[PDB]
Write a protein that binds this ligand. Structure first.
Ligand SMILES: N[C@H](CCC(=O)N[C@@H](CS)C(=O)NCC(=O)O)C(=O)O
Ligand SMILES: [Zn+2]
Length: 628
């Protein structure tokens, strides 16, 4: 039913073949995968064996009969098929895809059991280790990070999102373990089962000093003991409301439980949607619940990504792009529509910045990607699949008649492809097949531009209300700073209630907008907050309750950015002290850049003080940012 513009692009088979794997995944059905692992903090490496039950698949005549797995920097100790040594070879590593594991399968049967014993290497890319000086708890920690193609560096496997397998796991570890599955009931061997098929990239493992507490009827939180009581409180009141909000929009939650792991303070990343165990950063804990809207993202993934998966990294938008959409649908259901549109607006800025900042936008800003076997999927990561993808789905919601008319397709799509993987073409077909009465409407969508052209997509029209309220107030501050003289003059034009209704994103955007000297392009030429310390100190005093006393990390960061920009020298020490309490790249790295710009000495001293309490990658970058 599709337009020619994209029928010409259509592959011979769908799901489109995944160039980013060296494995011959098309030739097997993975009936089940068993992981038998042992963690060694001593050696900072993971050991054991993986056991696949495979069925050979057949098609056509006179075909090859092979067995190829992916590995990256992995020590493959031995290989058994149906309880017998099978000859094997690790091919010469090539970049960026790794080392093909070729196995000579001497068996007769189309069904067999494949067992591979391995150790991770000191060059393993899948695992992140931290020492006791890098956790507040005092004890060590390890967590996995598999997306996009690092699972092959954790265990030999068919490392493509086109392949999904139920899992079982037995993990042995000195400290407690959590896994991307549901724990079964040695005092320190930990067993799990994932009864819903998953792709390797969604496998999650973590181990360290971990406690657990209920945050709802089907939700438990895991974190360091000291933090447990604060994490319990943060999520208690909203996690279930969130899950039900999502089921009501899409359909029933499938995985049984939704659990959250609040990683150690040195955890440098943002979050990860591992099935049954969502990885989260401690910077959600705001002590006022101002940062939980975020939990919507990884929750949505339960459907977009985990349940219905992109078949390859050319089609990642099907994953993240849908997630942003559903994410925003959930926060819309809870906070209203203007709030959904606010997120959208912001996403649009982020998108424009992303594309303006790329090396090679011509290639990496197209929605559907084209990696072949020689591009590192990580190089194609941008805001594009998130926002350009979201915007297509929003454009579709709009031109098909809104949520009442779109929702039915949402449920059809996720039900159709449940526990399966697809490309962009199967997504369009499904679209067309479901709206035979709207063929007129779909045909008028510029598919070439949306899926395949670089740069910004057709600009949408969002409810700009929440933004305008921020811009108005920041402009008025900038304008007033120029002519008012006294702290009591500022208490006469402003008051704590100016911002009483500002959500987190609004405060963050308010501080960001101030540092940009307002929103009107009719900005003052020579304006510099540093030149108006009466003004700036009054802004912080008057808005002390929601800004200065906020323990939300996103607002704390911006408050600091405004303080350094207003050159309030007495605050530099507080920014410096704070950088020793957070581990996220997002804050730590820019944190030192700010600091360095106003007090290089305090910066260098601060780094020296804290450098060894950070995730190694955060230490290395910051160290070199500071010309060390
Ligand atoms: N065509 C192979 C079957 C493998 C095969 O060579 N089968 C052998 C067993 S060693 C055989 O004896 N087939 C002939 C027969 O059973 O008469 C597949 O399904 O992947
Ligand atoms: Zn995501």
């Amino acid at each position: 039913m599709l337009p020619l513009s994209i029928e010409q692009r259509r592959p011979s088979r769908s799901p489109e073949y995944d160039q980013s794997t060296l494995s011959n995944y098309k030739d097997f059905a993975v009936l089940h995968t068993d992981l038998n692992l042992s963690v060694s903090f001593e050696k900072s490496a993971i050991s054991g064996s993986v056991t696949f039950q495979l069925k050979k698949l057949h098609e056509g005549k006179n075909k090859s009969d092979e067995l190829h797995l992916d590995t990256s920097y992995l020590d493959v100790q031995e290989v058994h098929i149906d309880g017998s040594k099978a000859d094997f070879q690790i091919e010469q590593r090539k970049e960026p895809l790794g080392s093909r594991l070729v196995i000579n399968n001497a068996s007769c049967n189309d069904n067999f059991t494949l067992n591979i014993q391995f150790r991770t290497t000191d060059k393993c890319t899948a695992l992140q280790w931290l020492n006791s000086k890098q956790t507040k708890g005092g004890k060590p920690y390890v967590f996995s990070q598999l997306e996009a193609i690092h699972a092959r560096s954790l265990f030999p496997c068919f490392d493509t999102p086109s392949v999904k397998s139920t899992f079982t796991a037995s993990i042995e570890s000195p400290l407690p373990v959590v896994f991307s599955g549901i724990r079964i009931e040695d005092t320190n061997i930990y067993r799990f089962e994932q009864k819903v098929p998953i792709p390797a990239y969604l496998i999650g493992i973590a181990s360290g000093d971990l406690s657990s507490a209920p945050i709802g009827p089907r939700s438990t939180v895991y974190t360091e003991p000291f933090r447990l009581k604060d994490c319990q409180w943060e999520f208690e009141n909203d996690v279930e409301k969130f899950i039900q909000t999502a089921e009501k929009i899409i359909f029933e939650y499938e995985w049984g439980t939704y659990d959250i792991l609040v990683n150690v303070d040195s955890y440098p990343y943002g979050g990860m949607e591992s099935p049954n165990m969502t990885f989260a950063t401690p910077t959600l804990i705001a002590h006022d619940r101002s940062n939980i809207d975020v939990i919507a993202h990884e929750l949505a993934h339960s459907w977009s990504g985990n349940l219905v998966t992109n078949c390859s990294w050319n089609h990642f938008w099907l994953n993240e792009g849908w997630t942003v959409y559903l994410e925003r649908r959930i926060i819309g259901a809870i906070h209203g529509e203007p709030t959904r549109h606010f997120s959208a607006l912001i996403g649009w800025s982020d998108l424009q910045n992303s594309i303006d900042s790329m090396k090679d936008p011509e290639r990496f800003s197209t929605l559907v990607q084209n990696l072949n076997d020689n591009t590192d999927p990580d190089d194609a990561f941008s805001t594009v699949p998130y926002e350009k993808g979201f915007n297509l789905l929003f454009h579709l919601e709009t031109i098909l008649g809104g949520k009442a008319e779109f929702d039915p397709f949402i449920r059809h799509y996720f039900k159709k492809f449940a526990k399966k993987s697809l490309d962009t073409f199967q997504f369009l077909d499904t679209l067309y097949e479901f709206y035979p009465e709207k063929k007129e409407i779909l045909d008028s969508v510029d598919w070439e531009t949306w899926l395949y052209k670089p740069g910004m997509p057709p600009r949408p029209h969002f409810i700009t209300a929440l933004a305008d309220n921020v811009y108005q107030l920041a402009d008025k501050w900038v304008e007033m700073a120029q002519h008012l003289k006294t702290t009591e003059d500022f208490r006469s034009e402003f008051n704590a209630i100016d911002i009483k209704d500002f959500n987190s994103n609004q405060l963050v955007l308010f501080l960001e907008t101030l540092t940009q000297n307002g929103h009107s392009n009719k900005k003052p030429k020579d304006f510099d907050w540093a030149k108006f310390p009466v003004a700036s100190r009054a802004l912080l005093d008057i808005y002390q309750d929601n800004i200065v006393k906020s323990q939300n990390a996103e607002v704390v960061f911006k408050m600091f950015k405004f303080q350094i920009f207003a050159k309030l020298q007495e605050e530099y020490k507080h920014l410096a002290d704070w950088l020793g309490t957070v581990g996220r790249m997002k804050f730590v790295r820019p944190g030192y850049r700010l600091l360095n710009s106003v007090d290089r000495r305090l910066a260098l001293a601060t780094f020296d003080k804290f450098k060894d309490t950070y995730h190694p990658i955060c230490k290395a970058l910051v160290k070199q940012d500071l010309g060390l």
